[PDB]
Design a protein around this ligand. Sequence first.
Ligand SMILES: CCNC1=N[C@@H]2[C@@H](O)[C@H](O)[C@@H](CO)O[C@@H]2S1
Ligand SMILES: CCNC1=N[C@@H]2[C@@H](O)[C@H](O)[C@@H](CO)O[C@@H]2S1
Ligand SMILES: [Zn+2]
Ligand SMILES: [Zn+2]
Ligand SMILES: [Zn+2]
Ligand SMILES: [Zn+2]
Lengths: 206, 205, 205, 206
Amino acid sequence: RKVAYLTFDDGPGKYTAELLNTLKQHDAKATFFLIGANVKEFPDLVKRENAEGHYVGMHSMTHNFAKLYKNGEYVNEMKEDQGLIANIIGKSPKLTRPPYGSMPGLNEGLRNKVVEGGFKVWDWTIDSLDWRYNKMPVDAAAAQIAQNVLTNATKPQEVILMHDIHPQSVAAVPAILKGLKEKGYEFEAYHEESHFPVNFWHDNRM
Amino acid sequence: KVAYLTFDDGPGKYTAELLNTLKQHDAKATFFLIGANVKEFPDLVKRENAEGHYVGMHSMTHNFAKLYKNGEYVNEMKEDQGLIANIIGKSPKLTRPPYGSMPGLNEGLRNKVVEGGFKVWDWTIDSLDWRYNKMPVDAAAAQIAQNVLTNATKPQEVILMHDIHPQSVAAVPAILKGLKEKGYEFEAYHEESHFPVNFWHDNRM
Amino acid sequence: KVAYLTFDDGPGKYTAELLNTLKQHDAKATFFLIGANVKEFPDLVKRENAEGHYVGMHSMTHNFAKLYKNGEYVNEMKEDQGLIANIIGKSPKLTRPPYGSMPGLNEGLRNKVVEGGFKVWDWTIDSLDWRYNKMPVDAAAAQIAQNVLTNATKPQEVILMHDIHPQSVAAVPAILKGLKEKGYEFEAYHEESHFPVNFWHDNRM
Amino acid sequence: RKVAYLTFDDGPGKYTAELLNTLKQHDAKATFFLIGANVKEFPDLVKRENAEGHYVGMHSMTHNFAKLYKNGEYVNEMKEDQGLIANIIGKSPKLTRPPYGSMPGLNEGLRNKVVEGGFKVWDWTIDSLDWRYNKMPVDAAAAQIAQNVLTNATKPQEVILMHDIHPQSVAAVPAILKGLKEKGYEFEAYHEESHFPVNFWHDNRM
Ligand SMILES: CCNC1=N[C@@H]2[C@@H](O)[C@H](O)[C@@H](CO)O[C@@H]2S1
Ligand SMILES: CCNC1=N[C@@H]2[C@@H](O)[C@H](O)[C@@H](CO)O[C@@H]2S1
Ligand SMILES: [Zn+2]
Ligand SMILES: [Zn+2]
Ligand SMILES: [Zn+2]
Ligand SMILES: [Zn+2]
């Protein structure tokens, strides 16, 4: 019962349709956390992500830690970001992904507000680190980013963190898909039907 | 074919229960205690060592920012070591980093720990007991047992559990027999027996 | 078995010399011109296209901080493109980034270049002609020719030279003879024949 | 006759001793550029690097850009650093290696001043990128860094950039040495009498 949840952060972007075709050609589903400025600039790609069979969840408006967690704007920005996304796909998604991860930004304070707001939070069990490989050939970057992902998948479920806004990332997903499939992983998207906690605070309320 | 049980965030409310459950099965495990739990449950701390388990450290505050982003880790571990040394008269070396060492334990802090004389242990298997919290104990526990019996594949395994959680302690009985028939034996960590088990694959710890 | 000679930082003092040498050997190459040298040597600019060579861009300021750290790359290439266009009646697409595209040409700027309609070309072979500058020409050139002949191994090669340097132009005859013996043919870059040669291996450029 | 010139920046440091020993097993020589405060704290290692056959050059006192270049203390910091290194190994080394490289810090002003004092300046032709691999298991990092330098050795001479002050760096050096040696490289130190220019400004006065 192996299921890979490929997640893509900070999108959508100019590489997204490309990633969206590679997903499609592999009949594989995934999940996308989007920034408010990009849901607005790229409303078609949003609508398409959802249309092609993927989960579209929030990732805030500002992606600003100081704003998100120190001043506690997090859920407000996930509610605003939610509204934009509904206006485009008719769903009001409930899963959020904290910029910079919930640890340590999501204190017990707003972790409460998150559950009192009905929202949900997903961190990740693999960190592709894709976004650091920005100073080298893109094919070389992709191999190392896939190497990272292929060699860290072991648990019955794995939540893989990637960003679809960097070229080296979307170039790695072909190898990543072919690799994990050889490892017997299924490439499903997140479903709200079947939620299970994935965070660093181990708080299973979200 | 050794198998090392580890327990975090204790000693706590069900720790007393757990030590007995272990005892009946001639099983020795490892505990990583929070500072305040050492202050509140000295007896349990004393008892854990007395019944042949390893008593290691899990820091003072279990606070990510303080520990790693501010580098208080070793300071928190040494002070915790002191509190424990006052009960068992031994000063343990083995630390279990709160939330794991990846990425929290940077290259620098990893120097301080090797310099401070400590080792570091993460795990290979996560019981995942925290998912099934505030939930019907026997149902939860049952799952937790599967969670660990399935990922038991390697010659040695280091299992993460938490004895401040009822579902976890309840899960321990089923794990014990299920793993023992898998050819596993349950030993405590021994300092002279040290071998690396850390996400960074850093073998100085 | 093609071989594309490319020349940077021109047109200059020895450019006319080189063009005759190219012409004498019925050989066609590629030039990447700086803006001010286009402004000063329009005839040489005019001549290069006229005799069948490719005339590309090498920016306005050849200044690293301006081009990349300040993101002026495309703009400098755009304005350079226009200056060339006013002479040869074409608006060329192929850019050769000052100092190579690595790492100066980041992911953001690489979009802009793709958006503006530009390609980018680095090289496979570095002549190292700048090492031997202000040096005894006959001696220098001989070495430089060998520097490229040694690294002539692949089916396609893009050789970096500078025709603002006397040792480099002096080296060109021997390369032409040496590569012709290696089975190579010397063609200019042609846009309908474009193929990626960029340190980033970015195949949109 | 190929030659790989391993260079290590920002030392000496706590992993230097292990690097020094690993170099000595493969009878391989290399080049060290050092920071003033580090020559002050680790003179055995300086003294030893030297004594063991490697070149030791400067990498400034402060490793601060605005001080080195925008304020133009490059030559000041290299001579001061040279002074220290001399009092340890009885040698005033002439070769310097600019922090963050020569481009674009060493403007023509500073570059004139550099040749005024008989200094040379070495940049590099391969950036191993070791220091960006501090967020993953060291063995994994060691491997990727290796492949970075192994798959970029093409030119008969390479000058490889590394930092001996990070663990994943000296960890990669064994595989680097086996790798290049398989490609026919030899591992020399820089030699003063044997100077050939390697800088981003193509200035062969340094
Ligand atoms: C100590 C800094 N931590 C991190 N930097 C990355 C961010 O750039 C991403 O946006 C975030 C969410 O996508 O995931 C990691 S976590
Ligand atoms: C804008 C270039 N930045 C760079 N950061 C790295 C630095 O951390 C090194 O110290 C330097 C010289 O040792 O080599 C690279 S280059
Ligand atoms: Zn993000
Ligand atoms: Zn814990
Ligand atoms: Zn140039
Ligand atoms: Zn440096």
